[PDB]
């Protein structure tokens with residue numbers, strides 16, 4: 133049993149977050165977050181460490197469940213979808229994506245691609261450089277949770293997978309290849325990402341305090357200005 137039974141066949145990529153709240157015990161880490169992301173936009177989430185950014189993105193994949201509010205995918209509450217369906221519409225790029233104790237190839241293929249299709253993606257992801265050096269190349273086992281790979285290597289494997297999956301929604305913990313041609317929710321750490329984002333959502337203590345484009349936000353001389361000046365970490 134799961135909360136949802138709906139299997140959306142074709143998803144455009146509109147994501148609606150409304151009145152979203154979450155807490156770890158008595159520590160409220162998200163409070164009434166509301167953001168509407170239209171299909172194809174790149175929305176950058178910024179804020180000091182601990183502002184709730186990672187937790188928000190995890191909630192989208194249902195790695196945690198919100199205490200209040202909703203996440204809609206093309207207007208359908210994500211909890212009404214099967215988890216397999218929901219995740220079929222999402223690509224996650226981070227250092228913490230779950231990897232199977234299996235080969236590089238099978239980790240990329242899971243969820244039908246040729247070996248040359250996978251090699252081509254590894255290169256574009258700049259991942260083939262370490263994968264070549266592996267004992268069995270693309271057929272090398274990467275260990276429990278990809279433990280034979282360090283964080284940056286694991287992220288590059290997630291990129292290769294995203295290049296192939298062509299998911300309508302990309303959740304990226306921080307390329308122009310994907311980011312542009314799908315809906316991108318990016319936890320931004322590069323100045324270039326916020327400078328070019330369609331919308332920036334500024335978080336502070338789990339709350340959205342500012343929202344807009346770089347030029348207007350920078351001029352406001354507020355939290356975003358301070359975050360941009362300090363290098364988004």
Ligand SMILES: Nc1ncnc2c1ncn2[C@@H]1O[C@H](COP(=O)(O)OP(=O)(O)O)[C@@H](O)[C@H]1O
Pocket residue numbers: 156159161179180181182183184185186187188
């Ligand atoms: N498993 C957990 N148990 C308790 N608190 C947590 C846990 N994971 C994260 N937190 C806390 O939730 C808050 C939000 O963290 P996070 O969502 O990672 O923010 P950001 O990505 O903006 O740095 C932080 O104060 C963090 O310590």
